[PDB]
Amino acid sequence: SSQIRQNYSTEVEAAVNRLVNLYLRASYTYLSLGFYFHRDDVALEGVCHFFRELAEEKREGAERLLKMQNQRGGRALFQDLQKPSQDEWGTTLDAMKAAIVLEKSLNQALLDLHALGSAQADPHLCDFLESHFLDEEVKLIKKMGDHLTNIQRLVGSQAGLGEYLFERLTLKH
Amino acid sequence: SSQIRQNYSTEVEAAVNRLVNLYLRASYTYLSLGFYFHRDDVALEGVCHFFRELAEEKREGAERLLKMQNQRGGRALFQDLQKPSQDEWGTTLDAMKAAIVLEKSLNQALLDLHALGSAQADPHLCDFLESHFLDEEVKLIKKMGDHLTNIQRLVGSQAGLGEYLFERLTLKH
Amino acid sequence: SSQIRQNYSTEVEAAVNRLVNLYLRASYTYLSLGFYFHRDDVALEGVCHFFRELAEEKREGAERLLKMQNQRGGRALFQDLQKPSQDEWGTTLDAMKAAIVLEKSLNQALLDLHALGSAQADPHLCDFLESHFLDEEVKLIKKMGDHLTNIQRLVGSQAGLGEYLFERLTLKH
Amino acid sequence: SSQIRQNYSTEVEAAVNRLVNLYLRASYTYLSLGFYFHRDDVALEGVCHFFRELAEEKREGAERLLKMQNQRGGRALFQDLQKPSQDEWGTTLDAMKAAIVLEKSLNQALLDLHALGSAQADPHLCDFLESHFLDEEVKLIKKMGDHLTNIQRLVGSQAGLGEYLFERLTLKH
Amino acid sequence: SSQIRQNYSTEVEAAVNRLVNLYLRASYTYLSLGFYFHRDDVALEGVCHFFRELAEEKREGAERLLKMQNQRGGRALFQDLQKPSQDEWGTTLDAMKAAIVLEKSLNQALLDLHALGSAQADPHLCDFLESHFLDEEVKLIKKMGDHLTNIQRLVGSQAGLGEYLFERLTLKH
Ligand SMILES: [Cl-]
Ligand SMILES: [Cl-]
Ligand SMILES: [Cl-]
Ligand SMILES: [Cl-]
Ligand SMILES: [Cl-]
Ligand SMILES: [Ir+4]
Ligand SMILES: [Ir+4]
Ligand SMILES: [Ir+4]
């Protein structure tokens, strides 16, 4: 409310609510990815666990944005959450490519919100993103890129072998 | 898949996916309730914590249904998640009345799914609900009813006093 | 005996004795599977251990049915135990396919006995199966389906390699 | 001195000395608030302790600015410290309203100094404020806003009762 | 200086300074190798760690030569450090072949310095090399030769598979 709010633009407030929606949508996408990889006809436990942990991380990012919205005196506003883009996610390679597309969209939204905060001279917002989001995102995208390279190296002429071995020897089970 | 699926009707599979959507919608409603009670112009920490814990419990119930869907060889299907019914939730009394309406709707959906499983002669489904959902729901609704009675006793002619005291002396902070 | 027996039909009593015979036959089949995979010309220790543990689990299921027969005042009656269907079990894939066929036959027998207990209004029998058998069976069939998918992914053009790797990196040795 | 000073404008140096004076004035105001609430005719121990802890926090903020002034090679310059604005502070509500006015003035001074550092291309100054001051201030103002809402809810028709209960059940004694 | 120097030829002093330059150049080459294998488009963590540890070992060898130069009363003289021979290092096989070429050049330089010390009748120099360098080098070259043989065995017709498996199952991650 107006009792605490100071230097917190309506533009930033609305963009924070939109970013919460993006993070919750990302969490829902990773929930779907995780359950897909634990199907009995997919059965890649390490892949399930990789995506189920990202579902939790994106939920936690949304909750940190909502706490910050309250700390600044803005008002959380929730919108409908669209379902994920696919019902079935293909191979581990297809899924990791979809994940890095999703993370680069989150990263661009973070960068756009940082730029709006810079333009609004809102240093608390800019520091909040720098401290809790921007490096987390760069680290995750680097990890996904490392995984993509290793998955791609393993396809060879024996795709099933390579998919098994990546899950067994890189991912956590 | 067809490799494991046995005695698991398409009707139950679809109703489980719908119930996952109801539980995730309930979780999203409790997320909104919790952040509303931590606004600086609402500021009831025990109420925030009560609803934020229910958001986590409803998420966990959705995840247990999704794991069971996979264990039976059905296929998780996600739909859009509608936003909660309100953006602002009024008093603790208004919020607890909305919560018990929400929980009785979840309970009726559980009872309806139990009845479908009974009709389909699916004892694993029926036991799953009895073991992980039906008593959890009766316990929670009893707790909410106890809270409603205590909140109602505290309104008197001093509503703000009563709301403070309930939060301080019943709810966990 | 007639001193304790109450609400325990002769139909359920006989079907419990038949199910004991099915579980003991299953145990004997898994004993044969385990010793086959420890032959020096087969030599897959993780596969031996997987099936030898199922031999013990099926024995224990038969013993829990026999204890329940006594607790209800029925009379255990033992029949001849037929030998397993094969003397040699082929590849790990062949053996896991035979195992899931065997487990779905046990599961159908459990479901049939639950339906008889339901028809006889024998809730102790129905609860006994729900509590100690039906979920154990769904969990095991899901595990076997996961293993089948992973074994099938590993066949590729290098079947021996895939069989080794599954035993080494999925099964316990 | 000139031996270490680099990228540290005379404008920032002077504004840091002014901000030290503001923080020390704030500390002196909170010292007065704390002793007022421990008068025998006021006697609100939790309120005394709340403000006496803020006196220490504002002192520590002044000392961190002075250490930074020295680390950058500027020169601390002290001015007279004006007495607090009141000798008696009224009710807990009056005192919490005066406190949030004081904290929003400190926050605006921090934001103004951040803007000067941005304009001077002094990233060490900007990071120093972001890291040790801006979030501390947003957190404190949110806490005070939460307290104001709870104090206001407790006034009702029984102001003394409400003041007692807030001190007893929210503030630390 | 002349206060301590005894039996320490100007020829050995100069050759020690040259060997320090060779060891520091080797360290810089291994730094480049390590960062190359942690690129997101290379992504072989065990290979990165193998070479980053050799960068540290070659630095430490240079520092032990410099300490000995001082202990004997010679004067350390540093020269420009040439950049490594490549900016990109190819496959793990290419990199391990370049590493063994580099180590055999260091070993030959050690042997040449031992021969100069022998010729100069400088037994402290000869013992220093025998005690801290010659066996370290033979051990490392044997390890690299073992790795080369294993990498070469893994190329087969599936080079990416083999590169992954070597990194996963031989190198430390
Ligand atoms: Cl959509
Ligand atoms: Cl809606
Ligand atoms: Cl037979
Ligand atoms: Cl004054
Ligand atoms: Cl060069
Ligand atoms: Ir910025
Ligand atoms: Ir490992
Ligand atoms: Ir993990």
Ligand SMILES: [Ir+4]
């Ligand atoms: Ir039932």
Ligand SMILES: [Ir+4]
């Ligand atoms: Ir209590």
Ligand SMILES: [Ir+4]
């Ligand atoms: Ir709690």
Ligand SMILES: [Ir+4]
């Ligand atoms: Ir039943």
Ligand SMILES: [Ir+4]
């Ligand atoms: Ir393992």
Ligand SMILES: [Ir+4]
């Ligand atoms: Ir085991």
Ligand SMILES: [Ir+4]
């Ligand atoms: Ir800045």
Ligand SMILES: [Ir+4]
């Ligand atoms: Ir308390």
Ligand SMILES: [Ir+4]
């Ligand atoms: Ir305290």
Ligand SMILES: [Ir+4]
């Ligand atoms: Ir020698």
Ligand SMILES: [Ir+4]
């Ligand atoms: Ir090992």
Ligand SMILES: [Ir+4]
């Ligand atoms: Ir290591």
